[PDB]
Design a protein around this ligand. Sequence first.
Ligand SMILES: NC(=O)C1=CN([C@@H]2O[C@H](COP(=O)(O)OP(=O)(O)OC[C@H]3O[C@@H](n4cnc5c(N)ncnc54)[C@H](OP(=O)(O)O)[C@@H]3O)[C@@H](O)[C@H]2O)C=C[C@H]1C(=O)c1ccncc1
Length: 159
Amino acid sequence: MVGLIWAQATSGVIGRGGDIPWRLPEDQAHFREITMGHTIVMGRRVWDSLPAKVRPLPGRRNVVLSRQADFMASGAEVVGSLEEALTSPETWVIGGGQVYALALPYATRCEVTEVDIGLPREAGDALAPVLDETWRGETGEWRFSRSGLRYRLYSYHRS
Ligand SMILES: NC(=O)C1=CN([C@@H]2O[C@H](COP(=O)(O)OP(=O)(O)OC[C@H]3O[C@@H](n4cnc5c(N)ncnc54)[C@H](OP(=O)(O)O)[C@@H]3O)[C@@H](O)[C@H]2O)C=C[C@H]1C(=O)c1ccncc1
């Protein structure tokens, strides 16, 4: 089982300038619930985007994909290919744009948070993968964040 988990603006943007272009701390508990106790896989840039105090993400085996055969990530497993990354029975891919696109064909679950923020795509942004008709989904109810942003959860699956 490979699952993907991300948060996106309605437009599809998930990343800009090396970070996430909104604040949504309400997202954190759901991300932990899905991922805790499991192997998580991320691209090298996503690892770089984690603050030092939070990386590796605790309670999860952190696996970092990089083409640098020598790359350095304390508390994480650096691998050079997605096949090497994917060895655990249940794996959650936690980004970024490159790695979601790489892992999508392997995935049978996505847990998506949609952020109701007006954020037109710009060139060079990180973007969420598009889910086609092979996926079936349930849409959750909108909630307001302490930031003022509405957000909602989708759970998608395909067998
Ligand atoms: N909104 C989001 O949900 C996310 C945004 N981000 C954002 O995406 C952006 C990073 O995505 P990118 O597409 O630029 O990069 P990555 O996919 O993380 O890494 C690409 C790197 O992986 C590596 N890579 C890519 N393809 C391969 C490959 N085929 N083989 C080996 N390595 C590969 C390469 O590494 P090296 O340069 O060290 O060689 C490549 O440069 C940042 O803005 C980041 O803040 C990342 C994860 C999530 C995320 O943090 C997250 C997930 C769930 N809930 C809340 C947040």
